[PDB]
Amino acid sequence: ALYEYQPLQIETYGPHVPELEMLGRLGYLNHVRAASPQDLAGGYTSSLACHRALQDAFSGLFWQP
Amino acid sequence: MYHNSSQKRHWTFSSEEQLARLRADANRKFRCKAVANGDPVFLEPHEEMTLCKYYEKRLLEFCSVFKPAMPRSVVGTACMYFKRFYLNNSVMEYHPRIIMLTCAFLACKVDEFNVSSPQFVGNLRESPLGQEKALEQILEYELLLIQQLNFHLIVHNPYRPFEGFLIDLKTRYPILENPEILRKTADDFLNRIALTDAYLLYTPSQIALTAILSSASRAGITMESYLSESLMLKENRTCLSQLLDIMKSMRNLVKKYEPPRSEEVAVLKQKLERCHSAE
Amino acid sequence: KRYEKLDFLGEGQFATVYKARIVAIKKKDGINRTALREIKLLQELSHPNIIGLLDAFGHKSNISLVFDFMETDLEVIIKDNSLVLTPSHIKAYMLMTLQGLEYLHQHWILHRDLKPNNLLLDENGVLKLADFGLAKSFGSPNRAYTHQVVTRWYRAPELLFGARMYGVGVDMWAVGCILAELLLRVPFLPGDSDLDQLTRIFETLGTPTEEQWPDMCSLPDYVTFKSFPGIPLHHIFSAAGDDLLDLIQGLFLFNPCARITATQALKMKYFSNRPGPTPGCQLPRP
Ligand SMILES: CC(C)c1cnn2c(NCc3ccccc3Br)cc(N[C@@H](CO)[C@H](O)CO)nc12
């Protein structure tokens, strides 16, 4: 009767996008503009922009109407 | 996200034949209503398509010279609105000149490009009285356009997937030394893609990837390994074959697209003015 | 149209809400931008903890939205005194809110208007995020967001300092304020001005240092504040257990980057410990 977390399983119909925390370690962030100190202070990081861009690049790539 | 969007669920169609069926049905419904109200006046669906292509080009011209500078995503949303509206409506019932302006208006609103109505209508190359008249027409047609879109306002453009593919290529495809030299030509190809029915038949990611690989082929650079290795298509060869077929059919779509001709455009415009005056 | 009006529910500045025969209808610039925002966002979302948009209609620039009717809201639950808020009920409310927020953030949408009256409850005990009139898509660098969003009592400190670019931290700080309201049955930080809100935040939780918020001084409306020790959280919430304190501290971290996301909060031990969240059917009905 307790709660066990289960990740949101939504089909993207495309290649798997690397996790947000791994973008810097995998080298993606070297190809997106660095976030300004004001951006970081507000909580906005370049990882978010990179993750969104990759997710939209890979979304529905394997989908046939 | 596109993968569970209304664009994929309701506005990406199986074939060009289905789009032709929808357009022909719209034309036939208008003909039935005009005859049941009480002749060479009516336009045929191919003439409707020619007029729609011409007025999409005018919509692009309007959005290009729009001050303040229209974001490219707003222009994409407006063009998608125009295509979707004239998938199920005829240029004889609703004039494309007003519908394109209404599409741009609704796109500016939906894409959070805050522009006041007076400064929206100030971009029209017309005297002020025409600008107020056009504003009233746009306000009248805004709800009609929204209803005809089935209240599906979020449009997924290929531009952000294009940026994501460029990031992925820069990170994981060192064979492509500088992916940025692909952008310009790819952008060009994207524009041509926008003139066809591809936005109604293919996912934005597929469109962006096809544009990128067409640019690469035009540059002489071959990137089969990016699909097979980087994109994980060597484990599933069938999916890779389907992707290749999608891209080839998209290139054929761009190849067989026909821009409207000026004389045919003028004749059809005069015919459409006749239709709207008689109606 | 098909709907015939039956009762009057509420009224806001943007719109007036009435119950109609059972649904709820919310009523030179053209169609209202807030209504278009709600339509365009709710058409792309389908989650059990996000309110669904059944239909819309209107005449010319006028437009009305149709939603499924919700029986109550978290504000009425919190303000009610005949109702006892057990840790299980609180956990269930937080769980549903966080599941809806995790789905919403996964699709790169910030609610930016989270508050107890915008968390609606149906007769089946399902909590739904509503009032997406201020919701916006985040993650795009070339998208300036105003900081007027979120009602002051739930506004995150980064917003109060003028943060134009932000992420899910605003929603998570609002969620922390909602949790504090659930625990105390009163608003946590009832500021009457932006300066007063910042003062209450820095006095209850201590003025954040340059180590708790590295670029704090770079924000547009940043104002140097006197140093408060901050009340220990176990004194504020005496009945709360250590797991709940861990969750609250995560939700109320001053660095928005370090502030726990909806997924991270869902993975916290507080939700997996016993007692489990009460089923929606057994949730309190005012
Ligand atoms: C509009 C739609 C999302 C909806 C459906 N139900 N519902 C309720 N039901 C709770 C209730 C029921 C009966 C008597 C009193 C209350 Br209270 C409140 C509400 N609040 C509105 C304004 O009323 C807030 O400004 C923003 O959510 N919106 C809605």
Side-chain angles (χ1 to χ4, degrees):
Chain A
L2 321 186
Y3 166 81
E4 319 185 317
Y5 175 77
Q6 276 131 42
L8 225 57
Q9 289 284 352
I10 303 182
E11 238 304 337
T12 72
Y13 305 101
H16 182 42
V17 51
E19 280 89 34
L20 176 88
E21 77 110 24
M22 255 294 177
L23 296 182
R25 260 160 264 155
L26 278 160
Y28 292 93
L29 301 190
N30 320 114
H31 310 113
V32 294
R33 193 186 43 74
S36 70
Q38 306 108 69
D39 293 309
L40 296 175
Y44 174 84
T45 60
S46 52
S47 288
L48 295 180
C50 199
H51 203 49
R52 176 149 221 231
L54 295 173
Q55 278 184 0
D56 294 287
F58 295 161
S59 195
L61 187 64
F62 305 151
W63 193 70
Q64 210 42 288
Chain B
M1 287 314 279
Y2 176 80
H3 57 254
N4 52 7
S5 66
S6 61
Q7 172 165 325
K8 140 185 199 294
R9 191 174 329 111
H10 311 278
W11 295 96
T12 317
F13 300 85
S14 285
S15 56
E16 273 186 303
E17 285 67 25
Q18 181 182 348
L19 309 186
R21 286 188 274 287
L22 294 167
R23 278 138 181 179
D25 181 325
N27 191 281
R28 164 194 87 71
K29 282 190 107 317
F30 176 85
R31 284 166 175 263
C32 280
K33 89 200 287 268
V35 173
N37 254 27
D39 40 340
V41 60
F42 292 114
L43 298 105
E44 293 300 321
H46 75 276
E47 296 174 321
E48 283 213 40
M49 263 292 339
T50 301
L51 274 164
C52 278
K53 293 165 171 172
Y54 155 100
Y55 274 108
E56 169 160 1
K57 184 178 247 159
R58 325 273 73 80
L59 173 61
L60 277 178
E61 281 191 50
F62 172 79
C63 296
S64 102
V65 304
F66 189 97
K67 305 297 148 21
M70 209 163 264
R72 193 209 326 91
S73 147
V74 183
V75 187
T77 296
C79 287
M80 182 70 109
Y81 284 168
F82 193 79
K83 298 185 181 282
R84 293 188 191 185
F85 183 86
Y86 282 117
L87 219 55
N88 295 306
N89 297 273
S90 165
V91 291
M92 323 176 246
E93 180 151 47
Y94 304 112
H95 203 284
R97 185 231 284 192
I98 309 150
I99 289 297
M100 59 144 288
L101 289 180
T102 315
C103 284
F105 192 70
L106 181 64
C108 284
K109 281 198 193 170
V110 166
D111 291 22
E112 308 275 14
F113 177 51
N114 263 63
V115 146
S116 68
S117 309
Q119 72 182 161
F120 179 72
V121 313
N123 289 276
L124 290 177
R125 302 239 195 259
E126 280 161 317
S127 176
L129 178 276
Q131 309 186 309
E132 292 68 85
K133 184 31 199 283
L135 182 43
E136 318 314 304
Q137 285 161 308
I138 290 159
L139 298 179
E140 166 199 314
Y141 275 166
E142 183 172 46
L143 185 59
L144 159 79
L145 167 63
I146 288 165
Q147 290 160 327
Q148 291 302 289
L149 298 164
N150 212 28
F151 299 90
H152 295 146
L153 309 177
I154 291 294
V155 169
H156 298 285
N157 295 298
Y159 314 128
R160 188 176 294 118
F162 185 91
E163 296 309 308
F165 275 123
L166 277 186
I167 290 159
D168 195 34
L169 284 175
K170 278 169 202 180
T171 309
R172 295 190 310 155
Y173 206 58
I175 317 194
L176 195 57
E177 169 90 18
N178 179 29
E180 280 292 325
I181 59 64
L182 292 191
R183 152 200 308 286
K184 158 77 45 204
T185 279
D187 197 290
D188 306 330
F189 193 85
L190 250 188
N191 302 336
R192 324 214 328 155
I193 300 207
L195 300 189
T196 78
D197 279 355
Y199 282 10
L200 297 155
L201 306 153
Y202 300 120
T203 78
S205 50
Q206 284 158 12
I207 294 158
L209 185 58
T210 301
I212 283 149
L213 292 212
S214 297
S215 183
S217 292
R218 184 183 197 251
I221 295 162
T222 299
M223 315 168 45
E224 180 255 31
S225 41
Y226 177 65
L227 312 190
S228 61
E229 324 295 306
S230 298
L231 291 195
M232 221 78 210
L233 292 180
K234 58 182 175 302
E235 196 185 332
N236 184 2
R237 327 286 275 119
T238 50
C239 181
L240 172 53
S241 68
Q242 318 213 144
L243 175 54
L244 254 52
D245 292 317
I246 285 161
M247 299 168 56
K248 162 150 219 306
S249 38
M250 267 189 48
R251 289 195 298 284
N252 282 81
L253 267 193
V254 184
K255 205 166 280 132
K256 83 190 154 230
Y257 161 85
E258 261 321 287
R261 316 191 315 264
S262 306
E263 308 87 8
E264 181 192 5
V265 152
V267 173
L268 284 185
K269 280 175 55 160
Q270 168 261 138
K271 193 167 166 184
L272 182 63
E273 308 263 315
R274 287 204 335 259
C275 291
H276 280 281
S277 301
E279 142 182 79
Chain C
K1 273 67 173 176
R2 158 296 191 191
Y3 323 93
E4 337 292 350
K5 177 179 185 176
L6 276 198
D7 281 309
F8 179 90
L9 298 178
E11 184 151 350
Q13 53 160 351
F14 290 124
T16 170
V17 182
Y18 73 85
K19 165 173 162 178
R21 183 257 298 210
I22 286 295
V23 306
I25 287 161
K26 161 197 268 242
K27 309 262 307 313
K28 252 51 147 200
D29 74 284
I31 293 207
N32 179 225
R33 274 178 158 80
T34 302
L36 278 192
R37 187 169 301 113
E38 187 141 71
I39 284 172
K40 84 194 177 207
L41 288 177
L42 284 198
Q43 285 290 88
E44 301 313 279
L45 307 165
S46 158
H47 188 271
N49 296 132
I50 296 190
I51 194 81
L53 169 81
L54 311 185
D55 188 44
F57 61 86
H59 266 21
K60 206 194 175 181
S61 310
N62 302 341
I63 186 148
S64 324
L65 314 190
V66 183
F67 309 85
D68 52 329
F69 175 71
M70 299 306 284
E71 175 168 40
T72 66
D73 74 317
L74 210 63
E75 185 98 292
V76 162
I77 297 290
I78 289 160
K79 294 176 152 357
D80 204 322
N81 293 318
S82 151
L83 304 200
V84 174
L85 257 45
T86 83
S88 291
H89 304 331
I90 299 175
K91 186 185 299 193
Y93 292 140
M94 301 321 293
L95 201 53
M96 289 184 281
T97 316
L98 282 173
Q99 287 168 328
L101 219 50
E102 170 188 46
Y103 179 104
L104 191 67
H105 294 332
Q106 162 131 324
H107 297 83
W108 298 90
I109 299 301
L110 298 183
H111 190 291
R112 311 194 303 167
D113 164 56
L114 285 174
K115 74 186 53 73
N117 61 55
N118 283 338
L119 309 187
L120 306 187
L121 274 303
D122 49 25
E123 56 304 356
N124 292 316
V126 176
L127 182 145
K128 296 176 199 295
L129 320 181
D131 204 333
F132 286 73
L134 301 163
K136 205 176 211 299
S137 96
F138 76 107
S140 177
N142 304 22
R143 207 73 140 161
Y145 329 119
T146 206
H147 40 280
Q148 189 75 10
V149 310
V150 196
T151 290
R152 156 168 313 116
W153 294 353
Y154 312 90
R155 197 168 304 136
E158 68 260 30
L159 288 179
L160 291 151
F161 280 142
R164 312 281 200 290
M165 305 279 337
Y166 46 86
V168 316
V170 300
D171 287 297
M172 310 306 313
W173 184 282
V175 152
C177 292
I178 285 147
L179 176 51
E181 193 162 344
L182 278 169
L183 294 166
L184 311 165
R185 315 296 299 270
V186 297
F188 191 37
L189 303 151
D192 38 70
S193 76
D194 285 342
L195 288 85
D196 190 44
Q197 191 66 29
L198 277 171
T199 311
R200 290 185 180 252
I201 286 178
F202 295 168
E203 193 144 32
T204 303
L205 302 169
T207 282
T209 87
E210 335 283 6
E211 301 149 291
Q212 310 212 278
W213 197 341
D215 302 83
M216 194 177 87
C217 309
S218 73
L219 280 156
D221 315 328
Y222 169 79
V223 163
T224 302
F225 269 63
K226 97 179 197 181
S227 300
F228 310 86
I231 312 171
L233 288 190
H234 57 295
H235 288 173
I236 302 154
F237 313 105
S238 42
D242 309 359
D243 50 356
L244 187 38
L245 278 306
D246 267 341
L247 167 72
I248 293 158
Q249 204 57 327
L251 288 169
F252 277 122
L253 286 182
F254 281 110
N255 196 6
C257 299
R259 194 171 306 145
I260 58 172
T261 74
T263 303
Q264 284 178 315
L266 286 166
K267 295 190 192 208
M268 275 225 168
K269 308 197 43 85
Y270 163 70
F271 293 107
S272 43
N273 295 342
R274 44 213 68 111
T278 38
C281 55
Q282 302 168 355
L283 279 172
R285 299 276 221 88

